[PDB]
Design a protein around this ligand. Structure first.
Ligand SMILES: O=C(O)CNC(=O)Cn1ccc2ccc(Br)cc21
Ligand SMILES: O=C(O)CNC(=O)Cn1ccc2ccc(Br)cc21
Ligand SMILES: O=C(O)CNC(=O)Cn1ccc2ccc(Br)cc21
Ligand SMILES: O=C(O)CNC(=O)Cn1ccc2ccc(Br)cc21
Ligand SMILES: O=C(O)CNC(=O)Cn1ccc2ccc(Br)cc21
Ligand SMILES: O=C(O)CNC(=O)Cn1ccc2ccc(Br)cc21
Ligand SMILES: O=C(O)CNC(=O)Cn1ccc2ccc(Br)cc21
Ligand SMILES: O=C(O)CNC(=O)Cn1ccc2ccc(Br)cc21
Ligand code: NA
Ligand code: NA
Ligand code: NA
Ligand code: NA
Ligand code: NA
Ligand code: NA
Ligand code: NA
Ligand code: NA
Lengths: 380, 380, 380, 380
């Protein structure tokens, strides 16, 4: 019925054989056959299928209201498998500010294989329509994006893709299946870096993909079996375990996000704040129409580099590290950490200022996170 | 000094911090930074590098006398990363009977990206010279091959690749680093399905790659970080653990291989036997010059399908399952299991007869394995 | 500062060496020494100490405001280590309705070693005073107890123990450190079955012990090292991971407990309800004075055995299984499952009626759990 | 049939459900019941039984030719469970030089519970007969012992125990089930620190117990369930995995032991050598009659403390660390590490001289281990 119940009882995460209430960890590569070709339970070689991996795949398919799930060794392995649905000469449209790893994979790996890409401003969906070429085969969007949290209309993107015969893909990492379900809005394929919120404990690198399309699922299964970027069984188990608390974790994160944004907007040492919950944020209405909650990633401007570094050093409960979706609140400076190779003037033009700080809100007490960030900002 | 000592003390497989005599399992995705950009020990995000994975990479680099190691989520993920060194329009030469997964990846995935491939009989190395095109960039060989154990001259292949400016790659799965070291013979890149002998216990799916070439290593590291087919930390740990006994396991397997082949050659229900240790085997001399032991994979002909099935049912110590390199002796029928989609007449032309049986010799007692297979053959 | 923050940042659960934001899993038995007797980081043999186990021990010591933590292979191993503080001829007072495993250990194992025990009604603390013998050395209490949730005054029990020179022990499993902190109320030793709420995911069997007493800690460390009921490193890691969400899980459980109790009290198919939150419950005031929340275990009477079985079969979201503290809501019938060997008339005298049902509330949606249990009760 | 085959195919170490060729890791605490009291496969709570633990228990029962196996959290937890078969007032006879942890457990823990113990020289079995008291209930022997490798006659000890109504127990750690099978010689209970040779990779702390006696098995199962020193599932899995190579590892170790002893006997810097393979060793004939191989533990005298330390520093392939049964060769000095709290004059009287060195031979190349130790001794 309701989402918190579905997180516990959705998917197949018990052992039919013993009744174990958690998925057994099948640390195994191969399986006995009683007769040549007769598989006891459908398993024959762990690259092709492994029962613990099948469990986490059933979970992500259930949570995204899809039919087929796929677990990969990383988020970018999931993205690469999806891109491999295309051939040399095919074209992809993506949002302009896609994740740096996605940008790198597309422009430094897959363009060498003849895949063509264009990065356009999808916050106006007619930009997608203009960018469609006779060779376009795929539309790939993140919403909200990193680190400025730009929002793209999922339902309209799906309609455009359907009209023009494109495979539509949404990277749903930042919102999770708890708040945003792209397959329900007509999208062909949804994917996640499960490294972030889904695992939730900063202890698994993994990607997850879900679809309702039987033919796309067959193609993805073939790509996974042939290029072999599969998630192992221990990591699959830890993902299943982490997903159990996704609802509680996201709800705590959201309570803190709301109070933190209030504080940041009031604080004189903070300038622009970037988050889709802010009513003046571009496509705020679109976000609220396609999601019933918020990501825990917030970006905001302080004055300069020295102020950003001082902010990081003055906090007690914000941890300097890469990644997001931890139980810990994480803090970073995109201009120094993720966008550092981009020329400074171009960073500034794109809004990635020296003083732009990104936080990924964790599950600490809300009052503590607000007070800690506020007292640290008071030292500026 | 000697190989069995190198297996124990080669590579870095202890904890410098606590002194733990085994590699800690870093079930983690990200790492604290004390200052922005300052990494305590060089780690920042587990997709890019993870200390347990670094341990297994150091092991495979040491055992193959290379400088750089890479651990992937599967053997075919290692192969795919190596193929991704090339661009659309580049050409690869491979041996004619390459592993089915390699054949599938190349002809159903990478040809869609404009990679061109030719499968030629590399048992005569002048066949390679004839097949070189102006666009050829890579030579990829297995030796010995599956399931007929064809042998290719590694040193001559390396010389040809060097003269013609090709990247040379050897899939060294069947021989392992214990018996055959392609990098020592001039090969650029060596790779393994660690799923087989290296892990050794049928409980990890994994690939390993080693090279001495700094530039190829940089390119492989970029591909691994960008497409993300990385091995997780638990599987990395189990690989390090399994490799400790590689020498003892391979030596037991070899003692059994020799006695089993004697039995098969004497038995009236067995026709042709395929293994590089047989003195009339093509390129037997080449194999003995480039390896100081043998693979545990043997193929041999019985009369027909019914005889093969009866053989499988009559054995007590041979287990019907996919894969090789277990501690258990495994048995299979290629025409029914791995080559089944190929037309029967073409199978026969290629020597994959209905009665061709493949065994992967395990570490059971030699007398038991000989006697068991012999008594089972006596029922034919 | 606040409890939810302490759950994330309390204890030492990162790697000082690499900066890994999770505790490495030291799957190791022994440690290099650079010189005889010189330990790099204090580790020499994993039975004596293991760094992953040290992490979970630091967590439980922090959460209970103690100084020393100890991790055992099970809750009853923790209890047995604590009982082994005593000698033949020493006497223990315990509450009358102590956990069945504790009762069994004391009356079938430790009485064979000359430990004397008396089980008295500790809901009136003067019962403890009367039961003190010249040989009494320990007072061991659970609060609230199972399955009728009897409450014992912790502060008064600690005062009695101090005045009479007894070691005071509280089994704090049902309340967890999130709601009840016996060491703060003067108790010498607090212990948990971490199998229940602390691990929280039904996937670790483990016990945890904490104390502020240096001498008791030294004695417990000696007992643990000598009898060896230690928690392994993988289970220690999973405990550390599970504890991160303890606050969120307990708070969800408590919201559901309150609404479920309202429903049960209103329902005509339910008679007596047992839970310390009910204002007419014995020692309700005492509980509220020593805890700031509630356990998720509730017991309630339906008519008979057939009604209890029908209730179990009619629910969709209550799972029939042993144990408590899962993410799933669990349901059981003590008279058939835990108290079955006790004569029926004695069960009835003790209030363990044929129709007594115990539920352990999980983290499913509150409305779903209420509605599901209510519709199932409507079928009676 | 033969031992190396039994190590692979003995016990139940596959999954009947999926056919997985390795034992699944049941990281779980509890199990679904379809009806109250109906267990799908006999599992209800992991402390009582866990399927991965059941696998390793089946292995040790098979390898020792027993009927029942038990897996504990450590060797000393197995020993403690066995001692708990007795009551206050019962007496145990043990060999004089029993393992220090066993000595400590008995004399500092179990004597506080009224168990009486005597440590006698069991190398003459009539010493046992003299030591029998009217209250003696158990005879507990190690053979060979540590660190001087004293040998006790197992068959005669079993006969004495049977005649006098004693439970007979052999700690078979040093020999392993590969070479010595006490249950076959009439002993009631055999136990191991699986931390040593059985796990074999210095990465599990664990104990194992086997018996053929149904009544002793019932009592041990009750003790394990009640005091809870159980082995967890990950450690159980790693034990099953390590045992696969026990035969190969022990045989390599034995080849090295023989050559190393030859070297030590010839070397002028070495005085007495202690190992049961030496023909002048006390009870050499007894050992050869009850075992068909040797332990890898050897002790030998060099001149003094400084010589022992120099030996340790001069070796390349001998590692200073506690424990034995690693894949690495380990070296230690009992007088400084295990026997240090004993007065120096008493150490000398017992033969634990300042220059007594203990090595635990690993699986490195035999020539390397011989040459390394010899060149290190040459520096003295
Ligand atoms: O949760 C929501 O609000 C909407 N989700 C649904 O469509 C309900 N739903 C679909 C599959 C499924 C499995 C278990 C449970 Br419990 C609920 C389930
Ligand atoms: O690593 C990350 O997450 C940052 N991602 C990128 O580098 C994306 N990207 C690619 C070209 C480019 C130019 C300006 C800006 Br602003 C961003 C750009
Ligand atoms: O082993 C052989 O026969 C040949 N191999 C070698 O080149 C020796 N060798 C190279 C690196 C290295 C590390 C540890 C040990 Br121990 C030996 C090592
Ligand atoms: O799956 C496996 O291991 C078998 N590998 C293959 O299918 C390789 N392969 C590809 C075309 C082809 C034609 C005849 C024969 Br014979 C083999 C062929
Ligand atoms: O949490 C409460 O209400 C009371 N607890 C405390 O006494 C606060 N406290 C004690 C140790 C400690 C470590 C980290 C953090 Br964050 C808070 C800590
Ligand atoms: O297993 C469990 O949890 C139940 N625990 C017990 O059996 C405790 N216990 C011991 C004697 C006794 C008599 C009546 C009643 Br009511 C309970 C009793
Ligand atoms: O191995 C020896 O020399 C003696 N051992 C035996 O008594 C043979 N034996 C007993 C049980 C059993 C299970 C599998 C295999 Br294979 C062999 C087995
Ligand atoms: O720790 C270890 O392994 C060493 N074991 C012991 O301490 C055993 N032990 C107990 C009293 C005693 C007196 C002399 C000698 Br010699 C040994 C003695
Ligand atoms: Na489910
Ligand atoms: Na659709
Ligand atoms: Na090393
Ligand atoms: Na080279
Ligand atoms: Na902390
Ligand atoms: Na106190
Ligand atoms: Na078996
Ligand atoms: Na017997």
């Amino acid at each position: 019925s309701n989402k918190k119940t579905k997180l516990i009882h959705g998917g197949h995460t018990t052992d039919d054989y013993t009744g174990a209430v958690t998925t057994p960890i099948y640390q195994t590569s191969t399986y006995l056959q009683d007769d040549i070709g007769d598989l006891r339970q459908g398993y024959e070689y762990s690259r092709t299928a492994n029962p613990t991996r099948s469990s986490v795949e059933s979970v992500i398919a259930t949570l995204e209201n899809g039919k087929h799930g796929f677990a990969f060794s990383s988020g970018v392995a999931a993205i690469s498998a999806v891109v491999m649905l295309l051939d040399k000469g095919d074209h992809i449209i993506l949002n302009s500010d896609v994740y740096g790893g996605t940008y790198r994979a597309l422009t430094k790996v897959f363009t060498r294989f003849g895949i063509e890409v264009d990065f356009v401003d999808t916050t106006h969906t007619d930009s997608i329509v203009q960018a469609i070429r006779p060779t376009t085969k795929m539309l790939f969007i993140e919403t909200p994006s990193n680190p400025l949290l730009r929002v793209t209309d999922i339902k309209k993107s799906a309609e455009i893709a359907k009209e023009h015969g494109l495979i539509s893909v949404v990277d749903n990492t930042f919102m999770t299946p708890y708040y945003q379900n792209p397959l329900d809005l007509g999208i062909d394929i949804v994917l996640h870096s499960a490294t972030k919120y889904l695992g939730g404990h900063s202890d698994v690198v993994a990607g997850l993909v879900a679809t309702s399309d039987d033919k796309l699922a067959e193609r993805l299964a073939f790509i996974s079996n042939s290029t072999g970027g599969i998630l192992g069984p221990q990591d699959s188990y830890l993902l299943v375990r982490g997903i159990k608390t996704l609802g509680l974790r996201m709800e705590q994160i959201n309570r803190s996000v709301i109070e933190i944004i209030k504080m940041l907007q009031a604080h004189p040492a903070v300038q622009q704040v970037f988050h889709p919950s802010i009513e003046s944020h571009l496509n705020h209405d679109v976000h609220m129409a396609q999601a019933d909650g918020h990501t825990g990633v917030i970006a905001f401007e302080v004055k300069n580099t020295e102020s950003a570094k001082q902010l990081i050093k003055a906090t007690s409960y914000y941890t300097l590290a890469e990644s997001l979706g931890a139980v810990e609140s994480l803090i970073s400076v995109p201009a120094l950490m993720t966008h550092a190779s981009i020329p400074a003037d171009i960073r500034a033009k794109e809004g990635i200022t020296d003083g732009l700080v990104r936080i990924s809100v964790g599950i600490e007490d809300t009052e503590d996170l607000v007070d800690d960030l506020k007292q640290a900002l008071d030292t500026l």
